[PDB]
Each structure stands twice: as C-alpha cells, then as structure tokens.
Design a protein around this ligand. Structure first.
Ligand code: NA
Ligand code: NA
Lengths: 213, 217
C-alpha cells in the first residue's frame, strides 16, 4: 500500500493522474492519491499563501505559517516529504526506485521562488525531507514536477499504473521509402542483440556522451 | 503569438495545461494549445495505434502509418516537431529559451516502448525534429513530459517576461523558535547580495556539484 498526498494551490492540476489510476489497484488498497488545496490552511479572509521576500528582490515566497499548519495535518512520523524545486537534489531513476517502497509520500508544490526555508528545516526535525529537481530547467510551480514524480514512482509499484535504447520498428517493413533494418527480420537472435548494442552505443555517443565518460 | 499542437492517445492527461501560468498565457492570447487524439487518424474498427516490434522484445511500438497521417495534417515545413523520449537529447533551460521564439511546436507523445523510428526520420525530411529527454527517469508516456516542456517554454515567451537559488524567507521574522538570518533584516543591500551569492554557491556544491565542475556523489 502507498499513500500519496499532494498539497498545491492548483488542485485541478492533479485530477487527471488521480482518474488514470486503475480501479483494481485502488480496490486492492495498493495505492491512494489525495490532493489538498493549500488555501484550506490560510489564516485570513484574502486566503494569502505568499508574501514579500526578506532582503528584498522580485517575487513572492510562500508563507511558513500556512505550510506549517498543512504539513502538521497531513504528515506523520512515517512521511517522506518531497519538495519539487529547481534548487533540489536531482530526481533520478534511483530515487524513483527508493521512493516506490515508501508507505507515505507528501508532495509540497510551491512556486519556483520557493517556500520559506524554515518549513523544510522544521519538518526535517520530525520526518524525512527531500528537495528534488526533475531537470536542468525552471518551471513556474511544483505541480508539473509532482506529475512526473508520481508517474516515475507509481509505474515501479507492481500493478499500479548505461546506454540509451536504440530505434524501434514495426509493420510495415517498407514505409515512405524507409526499410526496417533487415537484421531484425533475420532470425539470428545473437546477431540482433549485437546490432541493437551497437545502435545503443552510437545513439548514446550522439545524444548523451556524458553517460559514457 | 505561438501555436502548440499536442498529439496523444490520452488527450484528457493534457487538461492541466489550462491551470497556472500556461492557462494564463492561453487566456491572454499569447499561445494557442490544441490537443489531438491520435486515434482520429486510424481507419479500423479497433482504432489500433500499436503493433509488436520487429527483432523481438517486450511490449508494443506505435505504428508509423497513423503518426505519418497525423503529422502530415498538423505539421508544415516551419514546425519544430518535439518527440519526448528517455533516449532523447537533454531538454535544458537553453532549449526552453530557444523554443520560446518558435511560431509552431508540435509535441508527439508516444507510450508503450516508443514510436517507429521512421516517423521522426520521415518528418526530418520536411521539418526540424528534436527527440528530447526531460530527465534521467522513465515515464509510461510522453504526456507528463509535454506539460513540463510547455511550462518551461511558456514562462519565457515575451509577454509573460548556472547556479541554484539559495534559501528564501518571509514574515514572520521568528517562527517556531526559528529566526530569519539577521543579514536579511539588516537593510544592507551589499551584505544581503554577498550572503545570497554565498548561499547559492554553498547549495550548488552540496546539491549539484556538477554545475561547478566537481564529481557527482
Ligand atoms: Na509525417
Ligand atoms: Na512522419
């Protein structure tokens, strides 16, 4: 059983991933994904979630008082608090494997200017906190990153949801002047394995030379 | 303005594009985002988009005929065709800046084991084609990658408008016995700039030592 709680000011962003979960998995108690509007924990008639940064500069910083109350309600001692941010440790396939065996993920989606740092510092005194970046680019908010993390983690949970892969082919054998490589039709399975290893080597050199050293 | 066409067998997965800054860019007429069901280009009862691979292997490959016909209708010679795949070139901030100036992006999202290589190779005879990875992890399909690419690009388009950002703070100045760093309360612009620069470099070397030319953990 995995429980995922997402806290966002855009709860509608998450609805399609919730609906996509198979009934079988949910009915088997394998997974539960809940989405919470952060404004439920606001203090004021204006439902304020952010405020001007100390030390000045542009942008707004999300309020520690609101986030503090939300995580007090949603988190437990067992929780892994995930905070998507461009300033985070890299989220990789290794992370997704590690997190696929967690009982309770809480994903705190903020604006890219960020959540007051005391929220993560306070939470780390009573649970595990992971600030993570999904890649080498800035997003306006954590919601699109939350969708990537949920998908990367849940596809590794049974029943729920090195070199580059080389090119793939299916019927027909000739299409707009382009033939499927005839080795693939040869029935020499050792030779096909060697051909695919060479295609993966060439592709990795071209696209991701960092992966070879 | 900019046109974005997304082609998917799960058009419902793209609805989040109507939220947050992409939603605001759409409402303000700076971008038009159209989402198309690939199954619109099938001609059979079962509306089949996949078949077993040549050469063997697990799973299914998306058929070239259906993609060919979709991209013939949606794409022109001016189109940048974006194919999200874990086997792609890295998508980075520099890519987002470059694509922010494009008139027409088409995002072809494939699930299963991927799309026939001949779809990208054929499109590349007529238009610019970019196979891109948004990061070193595997997804079930290109739809979540498409939302990441759209968000990363649209926040840069004129009309909306290295090192890690260090920590940020707002009121109150003391919370649960935790104080905002005194320099940020001091009103000294040069000490604040100095402390923010140091915090950025210290976070970068802890979290992303690769950005400063050091070995990853
Ligand atoms: Na085509
Ligand atoms: Na094509």
């Amino acid at each position: 059983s995995m429980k995922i709680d997402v806290v966002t000011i855009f709860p509608e962003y998450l609805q399609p991933v919730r609906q996509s979960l198979p009934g079988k998995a949910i009915d088997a108690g394998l997974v539960d994904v809940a989405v919470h509007d952060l404004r439920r924990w606001t203090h004021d008639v204006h439902k304020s979630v952010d405020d001007s940064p100390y030390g000045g500069g542009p942008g707004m910083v999300m309020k520690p008082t609101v986030w503090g109350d939300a995580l007090d309600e949603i988190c437990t001692s067992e929780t892994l608090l995930v905070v998507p941010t461009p300033a985070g440790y890299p989220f990789t396939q290794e992370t997704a494997w590690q997190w696929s065996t967690e009982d309770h993920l809480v994903i705190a989606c903020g604006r890219y200017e960020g959540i007051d740092q005391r929220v993560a510092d306070d939470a780390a005194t009573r649970m595990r906190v992971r600030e993570v970046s999904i890649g080498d680019y800035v997003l306006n908010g954590g919601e699109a990153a939350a969708l990537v993390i949920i998908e990367a983690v849940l596809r590794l949970v049974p029943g729920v949801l090195s070199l580059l892969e080389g090119p793939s082919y299916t019927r027909p054998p000739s299409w707009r002047g382009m033939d499927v490589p005839p080795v693939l039709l040869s029935g020499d399975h050792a030779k096909i394995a060697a051909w695919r290893a060479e295609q993966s080597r060439q592709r990795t050199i071209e696209r991701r030379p960092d992966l070879l050293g």
